[PDB]
Design an enzyme around this catalytic site. Sequence first.
Site, short mmCIF file in Angstrom:
data_model
loop_
_atom_site.label_atom_id
_atom_site.label_comp_id
_atom_site.label_asym_id
_atom_site.label_seq_id
_atom_site.Cartn_x
_atom_site.Cartn_y
_atom_site.Cartn_z
N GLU A 24 0.89 -1.19 -0.22
CA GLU A 24 -0.10 -0.14 0.09
C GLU A 24 0.90 1.27 0.08
O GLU A 24 0.50 2.26 -0.62
CB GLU A 24 -0.73 0.06 1.16
CG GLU A 24 -1.79 1.25 1.11
CD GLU A 24 -2.36 1.52 2.61
OE1 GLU A 24 -1.97 0.80 3.59
OE2 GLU A 24 -3.11 2.39 2.66
N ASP A 94 -3.71 -2.31 4.47
CA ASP A 94 -4.36 -2.24 6.14
C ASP A 94 -5.78 -2.74 6.17
O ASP A 94 -6.48 -2.26 5.14
CB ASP A 94 -4.05 -0.98 6.65
CG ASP A 94 -4.06 0.28 5.76
OD1 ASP A 94 -4.32 -0.02 4.38
OD2 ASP A 94 -3.92 1.35 6.26
N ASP A 96 -8.03 -1.45 7.80
CA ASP A 96 -8.91 -0.18 7.87
C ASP A 96 -9.53 0.21 6.29
O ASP A 96 -8.98 -0.11 5.28
CB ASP A 96 -7.96 1.00 8.35
CG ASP A 96 -8.89 1.97 9.30
OD1 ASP A 96 -9.70 1.20 10.17
OD2 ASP A 96 -8.90 3.09 8.95
N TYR A 355 -4.53 31.48 22.23
CA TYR A 355 -5.10 32.58 22.57
C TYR A 355 -6.42 32.61 23.31
O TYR A 355 -6.84 32.76 24.48
CB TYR A 355 -4.82 33.94 21.87
CG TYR A 355 -3.37 34.24 21.58
CD1 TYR A 355 -2.55 34.28 22.38
CD2 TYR A 355 -3.10 34.38 20.45
CE1 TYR A 355 -1.12 34.49 22.01
CE2 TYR A 355 -1.70 34.75 19.83
CZ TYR A 355 -0.85 34.64 20.67
OH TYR A 355 0.48 34.85 20.14
#
EC number: 5.6.2.2
Lengths: 747, 747
Positions: A24, A94, A96, A355
Site C-alpha cells: 500500500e 491495511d 482499515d 489565545y
Amino acid sequence: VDKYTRARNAGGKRAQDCMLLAAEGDSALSLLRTGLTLGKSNPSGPSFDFCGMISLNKVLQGIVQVLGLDFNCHYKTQEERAKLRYGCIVACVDQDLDGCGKILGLLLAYFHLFWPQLIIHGFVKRLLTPLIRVYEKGKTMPVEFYYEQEFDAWAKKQTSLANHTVKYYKGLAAHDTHEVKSMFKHFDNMVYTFTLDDSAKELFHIYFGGESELRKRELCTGVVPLTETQTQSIHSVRRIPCSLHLQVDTKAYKLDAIERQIPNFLDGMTRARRKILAGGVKCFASNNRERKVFQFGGYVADHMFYHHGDMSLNTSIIKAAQYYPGSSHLYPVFIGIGSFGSRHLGGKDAGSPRYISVQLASEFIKTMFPAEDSWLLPYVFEDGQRAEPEYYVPVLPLAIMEYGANPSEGWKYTTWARQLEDILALVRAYVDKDNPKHELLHYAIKHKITILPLRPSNYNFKGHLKRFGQYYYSYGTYVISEQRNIITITELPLRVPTVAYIESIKKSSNRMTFIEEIIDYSSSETIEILVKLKPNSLNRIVEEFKETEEQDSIENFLRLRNCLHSHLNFVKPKGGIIEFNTYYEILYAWLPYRRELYQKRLMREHAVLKLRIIMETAIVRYINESAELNLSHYEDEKEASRILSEHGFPPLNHTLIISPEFASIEELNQKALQGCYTYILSLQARELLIAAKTRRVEKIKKMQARLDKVEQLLQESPFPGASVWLEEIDAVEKAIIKGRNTQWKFH
Amino acid sequence: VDKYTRARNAGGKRAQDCMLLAAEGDSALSLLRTGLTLGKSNPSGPSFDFCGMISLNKVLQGIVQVLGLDFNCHYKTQEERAKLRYGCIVACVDQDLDGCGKILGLLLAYFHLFWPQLIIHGFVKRLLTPLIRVYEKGKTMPVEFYYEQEFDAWAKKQTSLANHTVKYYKGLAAHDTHEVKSMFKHFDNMVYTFTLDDSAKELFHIYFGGESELRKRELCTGVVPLTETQTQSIHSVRRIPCSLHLQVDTKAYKLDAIERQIPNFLDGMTRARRKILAGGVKCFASNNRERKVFQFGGYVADHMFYHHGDMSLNTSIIKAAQYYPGSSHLYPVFIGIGSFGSRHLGGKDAGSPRYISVQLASEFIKTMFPAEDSWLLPYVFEDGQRAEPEYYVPVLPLAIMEYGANPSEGWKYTTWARQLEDILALVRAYVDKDNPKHELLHYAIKHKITILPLRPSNYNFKGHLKRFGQYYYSYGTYVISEQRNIITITELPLRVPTVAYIESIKKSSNRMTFIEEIIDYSSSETIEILVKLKPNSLNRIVEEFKETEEQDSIENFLRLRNCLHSHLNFVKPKGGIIEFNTYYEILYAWLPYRRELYQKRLMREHAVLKLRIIMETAIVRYINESAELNLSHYEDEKEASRILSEHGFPPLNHTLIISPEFASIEELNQKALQGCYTYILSLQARELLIAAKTRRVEKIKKMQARLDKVEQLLQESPFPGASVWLEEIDAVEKAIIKGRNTQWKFH
C-alpha cells in the site's frame, strides 16, 4: 519503475512460481522487506527468491509494466497467461476501510475492467493479516481473529475477560517484530485469492461507473457485517468473492467518507462534532474552568479518539463556540472567551487557538442533552475503547434548529434554521395530551401532512423574509440620503459575509459604473456600509434596473436579495444516506427516536430502582437478623455465604447495582443475580445502630415512592414520559432564553 | 489599498488630528473595529471620525500609499510633515514575541531606514494592552500589569494569592468583550510613542543589517528583563525607546526562533523534545501502558502546553521512539511498538500515528534522568502554569551521546555520537577519587587540554572509521564477485539512507556508464545491494578511478566514504548561543552543572530531613505528654495552639514538610516555620497506642541514620555526591547494556 524490487526468478523459467507483493505504501513496503529478508531462521517462509515488492494511473502503468500485461490481450488461455512475468499479484493493504476499501477496491476495479479472466482464473490475491489478537496471562501464543464478528462470537463464549488483553491491528504498521515473525512464519496460510461471481459485474459498475444514481441508491442503506457462514466458507476455501468485498469494505469506506461531510438528522452534528461535544462534556464535568482551544483539542484527541489533523479539530472547536449574526450555531455548544470570529469575514477572522479559550455551556448542554439518557445511546468503539456516542438525541430537533451548510464538495447539504417558537409549538402539541389540535396533529402525522407552520428563524436578522411560490427570500435593509447622494446599507441578507459581499459588488463592472466609493464602518454586529455614487446617478440606476414586485430597483442594484435553498441530505442512525423534502419530514422522523429514548430511560430507571429496593430490603433484613445469626463470629466468606443462602438471602452484584453505567435492561436483569454477599460483610460498625437502620428505612420509603412515581409515569398517555418531555422542553426553552438574554455568556 | 478603512477626517483640514491603527492581522482588525464602533455608550472614547484601520514589501507599499509618505522626503520640518494624511500611526500587535518582536520590529526598522525624523519627532506609536490581569473575589475591577516584572513585584507584596485569579493576555484575541470595553474606555491612556536614542542606530543595524557577525555576537548573550526604573520611566512619560524594544522583544523573538532548531548542550534536546519527554514522564508514571502516537501527542498538547501543530509533534514523537542503525537516537526515550521507521528511507517510512504506539523506557529514563533532581531544575512557565523544565541535566552527557543534525536551514547543527566507553571512562575518572589519572584529568581540565581519548561511536556500524588529519571518515564495506562481475555492497557509510544513496548513484552519468543494474535486497538492518556492471568493466573502473591511500578505487566509484563534519552550536541554559570546537569542551561545560545539581539535591535532602526529624520529635513529645496535657478535652483549635506555644511546641507547616515539591532550600527554611498545629489534632485514635509510638521511634531512628549518611555524603571528596554520581553512572550503564541486548525493547 520506481520503488520496485524484482525477484531473482521473475521473468525466468520459474516466473509462474513467483509472487508480486503489492504494498500500500512505505510502511507496507518496510513490513514486506522485513518479512522477506527474515528468511535466515525461516527455511519454510518466503524470501526474495520468488517474492517481489512494489508500491501502489501512473502507478497502475508501473504495475502493468512490471507484470508485463497486455491491454489488447484477454488471457483466456493458459498459454497467453504464461507470458506474465509473475505468477500472481498479492495486495498488502491495511485492514482499515481507507486502505483495503479504496486502494484494493480500485485495483480490483482496474483488473475487472481490463483483464477479468485473470480474476476468474485466479491472479489477484490479498494479504489477510490478523485484525484482533487476544493475549492471555502466561500464554505466549495469542488467539488471532481476522474479523470483528469472529472476535465477538469468541468473546460470547468467554466467561471472563480479566485474564485476556485485546489488541486491535487495523494497520500494517501496528504489528510488532515478533508478531511480524509469527505472520511470516505462516505466510502461505494467509493469502486469499479473489474470485468473481454473478453480481460482481453489477457491483463494480455501481461502485466505479459513471452512473451516480445507482451509487446513491446503493448507498441509501447501511453496511451489513459478513454472515458467520460466509466468513467460515472464506476461511475454509481461502477464497474471497469480489462481491462481498465490494459490498462490505468499499461501501463502508464510501459511507465513512460521506459521513465526514453529512450530519445526522437526530442531533445535526457529524462524527467530529459529536467527538468534540463528548470531549467537552467529559472535560468540563469536574469544573467549568476555561481551557485554551489547543489544550481542549489535545484532550479530545487523547480521550475521544480523534486521529485526524489538529487543524480541523481546532477549526471545529472554534466554530462550535462562535456566536454572531449569521453564524452556523444559533445555540453554540461552547462559550468562547476571546475573539472567536466576526460576521464580516464569515468567522474566518477568529483568533489563534493559543489565545482564545473555550468553556462548556453547562446550563444549555445539560438541559438539551440530558445526562441520564447519555448512558442509553449506542456508542461507537475505537479499538475496543468507548468513543463518542453513535448519535445524540437532543430534547429538541437540533438538526433543523441551526444554520447548516457543507463547505466542501461532493455532497450538497444546506439547512436554514426554523423558528424556535414554531418548533416549540409543534413539539408541545405533539407531546401534550391536553392541548388544542393535538389529536389533529397526530392524525396529520399519520397521514403525513402539515398543520402547524414552520418558518425560517428571524433572530439576529434586521431584514425581511418573504415567500414567493415555494421559495423563501431574505432582503437586507438600506436607507438612501438624497441630499448626500450616498446609500447607507443597514442590513445584509442572511448569512452573507460583509467582506465577500463588498468584493462581489466591486467585481462587477456594471454596478461599479454607478458606484464611486464604498466604505465599511459596520460594527461587530450591525452593518453600516456607505456607497457614494457618482453625481446624477439615481435616475440612471432606476432606469437600468426596473422595479418589480420581487425586489426593489436598489435591491437589485446592490444585490440585497438571497434565496433560501435547502438540501436536506442526512445520515441515518443505522448507516446510509436519507433525503428529505421538507423540515416537517425531519421532525416527524426525529420524534419517534426521542419517544423510544424516553421509554427506555423510564424502563431502565424502573429496573434499577427495583434492584436497589431488593438490595436495601436485604440489607435491612440482615441488620434485623444479625442479633440471632451472629455473622460476625464467622471468619471465612464462603461459610457466611452458605449460611445466608440457607437463610434465603439473595445474591446480588454490588458494583453493577450501585453503578449501572451502560448495562441494558435485559443485561442488567441477566447478570445482577450472580454476584456475592459482599454488601453484608462490608457494612461499617456505625451502621449497625438504630439510627442507621431508621435512615435506611427512610431511604427505602423515598425509593419506593420514586418507584411508584416511575410506575405511574410509565402508564402516561399518549406515550410514557410525556410530562418529563414537557418539563425538559420547558427547561431547554428557559436555558435558550437565558443564553439569548446574555449573548450566550451565561452570567 | 486592501483591508483599509479610511477615517472621515483623514486627508482633510483635521488630518493631523487623525490616527491610523495598524493592525497585526484579522483578529487585531476585529478588535479595533469593535473598539471604534463601540462609541455609542462611550462619548470620551475614539471612533471612526479620527481613527482609521489597516492590516499589516507590498504591505509596506500599501502603508506608504495610505500615509502619503514620500521616499525622497526627509520630513525634517513641520511644513513637510503636514502633508501627511494621518497624524500618527499606531501599531496594534500582540504582546507575544512573535507579533510585537517581529512585525513591530520590522515596521520600526523600515521607518528608521527611510524616515527617521518621523521617529524622533514622534510619528510611530504602539498599543500597550494589559499583559496580566488579577481578579479578586467580589471586586469587579481587576489589577492590570503591562509587564511580567511588574506582576512579579506586585505578587512579592501579596501575603496570599488564594483570593486572586491571574489571567495572561499575550494576544489581542485573548481579551473578552467587557475587557475590550474597559481598554477602549481609556484608549488615550494606552498608546506609547516610540523614541530614538543614540544606540538605536547601532541596534537597528545589528538586528536588520547584512552583517551576520554582529548579529551572532549580539545573540551570544541572553535577554535581560527591563529594569524596574526603565519600566517606571516608560509608564511615566508614556514613551518607549527604540533601543529597549530592540534589545528585549526583538532579541527574545530571534532567540526563540533559534531555540526551535538548536538544542541545549546539557540534555541535547530542544524545547519541543523537552516538552515531549516531560509529557512522557508524566503520562506513563501511573502505568506504563501503550498509548497511540496521536493520543500521546494530545496529552502533551493538553498538559505540556505544546501550542504548535500536531504534525511536528507527531513527527518528533515518532523520532524519539525510532531505533535502527544510523538513527538519530542511540538511546531513544520511548519504546516504539509497530513500524516506526527504517534506515532505508532515513526514518521517513514510519507508520501513521493512528496505528503505531509508544511506551516509556522507564528503566532507562529513571536512571538517566533521576526523579529526585526533577524537582530542582528551573521550570519554564506558560501563562502561569508549570510547563517542561528549562533544561534537563542527565547523569551522562546526552548532548554528545547521540547523533544530532538540524534538518532545517538558517543554523548549522551537526553532532556525531561519541563512544559510550570513552565517555564513561572520562566521567568516571573525573568523579572517582581513587582512580588512575584522576588528578591528571583535573589538572588538564583546569588547563583545558585533553588526556583521555574521545572517538565516534562504532555501534550499529559494520564499516571502518579512519582518521586523516583532523577529520574522521566512515567507509562502508563491499565484496566483489569476479566470476559474476557484480559487486555486493554490504555496509553503507554512517547515517546514509539506502534509497537516497541509490538515487545519488543513479543520478550520476559517469558512474551509470559502468553500472548496468542495481538491485536492493537489503534487510531491515543489514545492507546488501547488488550492482551488476557491464561486461569487461573492472579494468575500466580501476583506470578511471585511481587508487589512493585515502580511499579505494571501488570506494570512490560507489561513493562509499562519508566525512564526519561537526557543527557544535548549542543554546546556553541562561539563553544565548554558544559555539564549541571539540566535544571535550562540551563535556567540560556540562560537568559543573551536574556537580552543582548533585550538591543542591544533597542540601535540599538534608534540609527536608531536618524538618521531618523536628516534626517527628514534636509528635513523639506530644504523644508522651498527652497524658498530662489532656489536649482532647479542649474544643477550639486556638486554645490548643496557645497552650502548645506556652509549652514550647514549635509551629510547622504540615503540607510543605510532608510534600516539599518545588520549594528551594532557602524558601523551605523560610516558610516552614509559619504553619499551624494541625499535625497534633489530626492524629488517629489508634496512633496513641504504645505500638504506634514504638513504630514512630523506629522511623525516627532510621531517618536520623539517613541524616548522618547525608551529612557524611556532603563532606565527600572531591565534591559532594561523588559516590551517588558513580552509582547512578553504573545504573545508567546497566540500563543501556540491557536495552542494547534486547534491541531497546526491555523484556
